[PDB]
């Protein structure tokens, strides 16, 4: 037995969770218990804290989602056969270059893209405020919110910051499955191949390292789960043979090692540096560097 799935589930009363300073008025009640989920992790769905930023995000994010789909249905001539057939092929495209950074564009040739983007802007930032506020309620550090900001960075660059600096909304990414892929491939071609963007290449090393490190870490905690390894917080406050055997596996393999707390600083950083370096690479593309081949040839 290797501890990828549980051999036995137990259930007790619904866990309505810790209280600290949270407003209990805004938490739901428990949802079902999924026995399926329970083989891998926890069986309990809910509760969920809603509140004001909860509903703003949730309404706002559905308005973005519906806006795109209503335009996909329109493109499909309102035919459910064509809709399902061409699903990956439809695209809400930003305004033409003609309209620059203007909100003048008609609904069928930009305006609809802008409406959907506004909604998405409210949805994401309100959700960011939510990850901070939930943590504050429980008296926890703001790690989750600051780590999330790194993801927001690259998104803000692609759809907002870079389209502004370049003086056109047409530079932004379209809402569509195959269209957003073509954009990505188009961007690289037009900027002389992103492989020569040194930020793109760091972005990849970190994406990579995220895969290699969570592979290492997950594997390591499962390997020492026979000494209560998963109980990271109590192993922090009172190091056990699990923390010791874990540190020593890696010391003896590759010559150095982590703490039970310290591995999590490695973890949060490896990950945020993906979108951090990624966003810088993109912001500098067409604003400062026209061609990463050409730039690379000068080195500067």
């Amino acid at each position: 037995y290797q501890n990828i799935f549980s051999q036995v589930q137990v259930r007790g009363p619904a866990d309505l969770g810790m209280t600290e300073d949270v407003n209990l008025a805004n938490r739901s009640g428990v949802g079902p218990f999924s026995t399926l989920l329970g083989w891998f992790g926890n069986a309990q769905l809910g509760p969920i804290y809603l509140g004001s930023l909860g509903v703003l995000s949730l309404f706002s994010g559905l308005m973005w989602f519906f806006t795109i789909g209503i335009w996909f249905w329109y493109q499909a001539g309102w035919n459910p056969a064509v809709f399902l057939r061409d699903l990956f092929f439809f695209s809400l495209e930003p305004p033409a270059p003609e309209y620059g950074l203007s909100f003048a564009a008609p609904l069928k040739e930009g305006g609809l893209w802008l409406i959907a983007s506004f909604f998405m802007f409210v949805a994401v930032w309100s959700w960011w405020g939510r990850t901070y506020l939930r943590a504050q309620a429980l008296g926890m550090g703001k790690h989750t919110a600051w780590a999330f900001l790194s993801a927001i960075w690259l998104w803000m660059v692609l759809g907002f910051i870079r389209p502004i600096l370049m003086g056109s909304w047409s530079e932004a990414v379209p809402y569509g499955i195959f269209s957003h892929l073509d954009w990505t491939n188009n961007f690289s071609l037009v900027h002389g191949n992103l492989f020569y963007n040194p930020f793109h290449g760091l972005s990849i090393a970190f994406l990579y390292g995220s895969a290699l490190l969570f592979a290492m870490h997950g594997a390591t905690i499962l390997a020492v789960s026979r000494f209560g390894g998963e109980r990271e917080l109590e192993q922090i406050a009172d190091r056990g043979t699990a923390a010791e055997r874990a540190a020593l596996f890696w010391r003896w393999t590759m010559g150095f090692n982590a703490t039970m707390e310290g591995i999590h600083r490695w973890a949060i950083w490896m990950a945020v540096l993906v979108t951090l370096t990624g966003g810088i690479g993109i912001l500098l593309s067409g604003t400062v560097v026209d061609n990463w081949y050409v730039w690379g040839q000068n080195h500067g």
Binding site: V22, M140, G141, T144, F148, S210, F249
Partner: protein, 281 residues
């Protein structure tokens, strides 16, 4: 030199080959038979790559590049200068990685832990062996493999990509990318949660695993749990690399046309193929 707690663990045993013979450390590093194997394969491989840099006539790591044998050589041996060095270095690389894995198994046995880490590593070795062995052999030349060089292996990626149009349209590539992005999202959150609990607002007590579950339920209505997130990280990342290997073993072999065109299987299905309007009618 030893960590304050280390000595009680430096006991004899857990070796797979040669009993007590290589059962010792050099500084922090455990050796074992597969320590000696790894050094032999690694040293031999570096010697060959330096001797390859001689024949190419450059000692710049931004130029050095050991290329497979050209397609016309098929699955045969080649002259060292014109493919044979790669062929031997590739055997030497495979020797180093497998030796490294089996060394991790010996370390596992001495420490009485599970074999999860070298089981996870085995997936990376299988990605590597796909690109330089399984795919090349199925295609019928070592020439189809990627070259060993820092920028020349990126050309190979780009040229192998654009042989099939925009390589984004490979459906197994799509799945693999989704796992890479999700794994990174999960690593960010996992590190952030544990640190937010161990390092709360100034002056307050360490939070508890209960705070960790509460925080998440509050946020998204579900909490996978401390054992589940470690199961998840391991699964997301081994999945990314699995589908990576899958996405390339089918490219050149069962599919050699433009990847975008593959999506016509869906569009041309009988019951909506001919229905006017939309993007594809």
């Amino acid at each position: 030199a030893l960590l304050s707690f280390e000595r009680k663990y430096r006991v004899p045993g857990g070796t797979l080959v040669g009993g007590n013979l290589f059962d010792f450390w050099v500084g922090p590093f455990y050796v074992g038979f597969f320590g000696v194997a790894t050094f032999f394969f690694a040293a031999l491989g570096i010697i060959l790559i330096a001797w390859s840099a001689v024949l190419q006539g450059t000692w710049n790591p931004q130029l050095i590049s050991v290329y497979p044998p050209a397609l016309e050589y098929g699955l045969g041996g080649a002259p060292l200068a014109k493919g044979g060095l790669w062929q031997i270095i590739t055997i030497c690389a495979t020797g180093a990685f497998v030796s490294w894995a089996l060394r991790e198994v010996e370390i596992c046995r001495k420490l009485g832990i599970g074999y999860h880490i070298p089981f996870a590593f085995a997936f990376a070795i299988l990605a590597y062996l796909t690109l330089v062995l399984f795919r090349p052999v199925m295609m019928g030349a070592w020439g189809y493999a990627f070259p060993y060089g820092i920028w020349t292996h990126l050309d190979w990626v780009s040229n192998t990509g654009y042989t099939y149009g925009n390589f984004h349209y490979n459906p197994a590539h799509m799945i693999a990318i989704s796992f890479f992005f999700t794994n990174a999202l999960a690593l960010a959150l996992h590190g952030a949660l544990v640190l937010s609990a161990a390092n709360p607002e100034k002056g307050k007590e360490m939070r508890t695993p209960d705070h960790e579950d509460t925080f998440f339920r509050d946020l998204v209505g579900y909490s996978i749990g401390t054992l589940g997130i470690h199961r998840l990280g391991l699964l997301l990342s081994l999945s990314a690399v699995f589908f990576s290997a899958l996405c390339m073993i089918i490219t050149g072999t069962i599919w050699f046309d433009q990847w975008v065109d593959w999506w016509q299987w869906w569009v041309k299905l009988p019951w909506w193929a001919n229905i006017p309007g939309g993007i594809n009618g």
